[PDB]
């Protein structure tokens, strides 16, 4: 649903224990995600919440990347077309 | 660790239970047979009192219920 709303990438992680002896964790991912530098500090929005259940406590972690441009990317402007002409000419 | 045994040697501590008093306020008057009603125990200095203030006259030492007027009368 995140990417239907137009997101460049997302990642949700859930962990804890609810109906088993030991803890279990899952992680689902799609799209792109950066992790290292200050671009990762600002582009990503994160949040973390607890939830209490009859048997215990579950931890939720959500990250969302919204697509002023990353320093690594480089864009080259298309060359403009021109046509050769005969050497002589005149004007006013 | 572990929780060791405890023996509180003193038997028990029992609070000051109030002895019963069955309307001892009616003793506090002396009515003159369908006339005026003179009073019994006199009053105290009553800078912050003045009504019904009785004085614990027992043995040569007295006090007020609120003012705590310790006076050695002898």
């Amino acid at each position: 649903f995140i990417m239907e709303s137009g997101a460049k990438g997302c990642e949700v992680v859930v962990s804890g224990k609810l109906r088993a002896a030991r803890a279990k964790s899952m992680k689902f991912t799609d799209g792109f995600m950066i992790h290292s530098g200050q671009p990762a500090r600002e582009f990503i929005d994160t949040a973390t919440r607890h939830v209490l259940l009859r048997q215990g406590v579950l931890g939720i972690k959500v990250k969302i990347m919204r697509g002023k441009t990353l320093p690594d990317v480089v864009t080259v402007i298309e060359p403009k077309e021109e046509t050769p002409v005969v050497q002589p000419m005149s004007q006013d | 660790k572990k929780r060791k045994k405890k023996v509180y040697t003193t038997p028990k501590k029992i609070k000051h239970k109030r002895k019963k008093v069955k309307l001892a306020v009616l003793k506090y008057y002396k009515v003159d047979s369908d006339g005026k009603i003179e009073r019994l125990r006199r009053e105290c200095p009553n800078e912050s009192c003045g009504a019904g203030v009785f004085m614990a006259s027992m043995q040569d030492r007295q006090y007020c219920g609120r003012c705590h007027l310790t006076y050695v009368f002898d």
């Binding site: 649903f1 239907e4 709303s5 109906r19 088993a20 002896a21 030991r22 279990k24 | -």
Partner: protein
Amino acid sequence: GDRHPTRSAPRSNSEKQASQGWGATEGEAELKDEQAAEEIAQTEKKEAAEGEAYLAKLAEKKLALEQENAL
């Protein structure tokens, strides 16, 4: 050694019941899960899509109005 000789009481570590607790690990169920995800997704989106586009105060103070006989 902290692994092989568990030092707690075995208490209902049933993977079968956990499958119900977490997610069944079968291909057939996932297709139904995807259909349900599609159904839930639309309703949440549409709500966002639709959304996006007798005076007595004086009497409180007035309590000293009532008066009584002098002396």
